[PDB]
Structure formats: structure tokens, C-alpha cells
């Protein structure tokens, strides 16, 4: 076995920006990695394709994954609405870490964030499950559209996504 690689094609107000691919650490957090992988292929009949990054704060992170309400309040996992914090083995060590957003202990759904800096205050509270493999320059380009309070100036969407490996 090998860790799955999934990709997102990002568009800015409908114009293609580029592809970011991610390695998911299924060897360390199998349940959390599987949730993100199945939401990226859309194989359960719902997922990330066509959803947006609703909150981007330059120097911190890009947050997305609300494919139900689309405004930052929704999303659901493939296990039902929410699931537990699988473990906190991995930390938020630098740019490119993929981690889960939540509303406290054991509330993981589908929303996630890509870190653009080390965010150690989130360690032990948000489950790290992947990292950017290629396309960190597209994540950096995305940051230019965010703001200190998180609203974006352009609509940043996942135009397409799926599994490569």
C-alpha cells in the first residue's frame, strides 16, 4: 500500500489557477484520510467538487470544505455528520500541512484548512492528516485573495478534484 494522493484544480472567479496535489497520511490517520479521499472523488454521491474556500487569512491558512451550506457553517463526513478526533500524532509544523477544522473535541465533518505557516497553537486540537505534495505555489497565489478577517475578494473554487494514486 501507498498513501493516496488527491488533487484539487482551483479556479478564481471561474478562471483556472492550477492544481494542488496532496498526500494523505492514511498510514497514521486512516479514518480521517479516508474521509477526505472519498469526499475528493465524490464517490458517496457528495463531496468537494464545485465548493469554495470560504475563509483565507494571508500568513495563516486557507479554509474550505462546506459543500452543503457553502457559507462556512456546513459540510458532513462520509461517516454521518461528525466523527471523533482520531489522534494528534502529527503537528502543524509549517506551510503545506492539511488539517481538520472543527467546533471543539470530536466534531470533524468535512471542513479542512491548508496551513501557509507553522501554527503550533492548533496542535492537539485539530487533526493533521495530509500535506501539499505539489502546487504550493498555487496555495500561495490563493492567499492573495484573502484578508485579515478571512473574506475573499474573489470566489475561489475547487473546479475539479479526484484521486491520482
Amino acid at each position: 500500500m501507498v498513501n493516496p494522493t488527491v488533487f484539487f484544480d482551483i479556479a478564481v472567479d471561474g478562471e483556472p489557477l492550477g492544481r494542488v496535489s496532496f498526500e494523505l497520511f492514511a498510514d497514521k490517520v486512516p479514518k480521517t484520510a479516508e474521509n477526505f479521499r472519498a469526499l475528493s472523488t465524490g464517490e458517496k454521491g457528495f463531496g468537494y467538487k464545485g465548493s469554495c474556500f470560504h475563509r483565507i487569512i494571508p500568513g495563516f491558512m486557507c479554509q474550505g470544505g462546506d459543500f452543503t451550506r457553502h457559507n462556512g457553517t456546513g459540510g458532513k463526513s462520509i461517516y454521518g455528520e461528525k466523527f471523533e478526533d482520531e489522534n494528534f500524532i502529527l503537528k502543524h509544523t509549517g506551510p503545506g500541512i492539511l488539517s481538520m477544522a472543527n467546533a471543539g473535541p470530536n466534531t470533524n465533518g468535512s471542513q479542512f484548512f491548508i496551513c501557509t505557516a507553522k501554527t503550533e497553537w492548533l496542535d492537539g486540537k485539530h487533526v493533521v492528516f495530509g500535506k501539499v505534495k505539489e502546487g504550493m505555489n498555487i496555495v500561495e497565489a490563493m492567499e492573495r485573495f484573502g484578508s485579515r478577517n478571512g473574506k475573499t475578494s474573489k470566489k475561489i473554487t475547487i473546479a475539479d478534484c479526484g484521486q491520482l494514486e
Binding site: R55, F60, N102, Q111, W121, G150
Partner: peptide, 11 residues
């Protein structure tokens, strides 16, 4: 501040 939540986003 700098949190990443779903529901009540804080400062």
C-alpha cells in the same frame, strides 16, 4: 485571533 472553527468563528 487565529482559529479554524465551523459554527462560531472567533477572533
Amino acid at each position: 485571533x487565529l482559529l479554524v472553527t465551523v459554527g462560531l468563528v472567533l477572533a
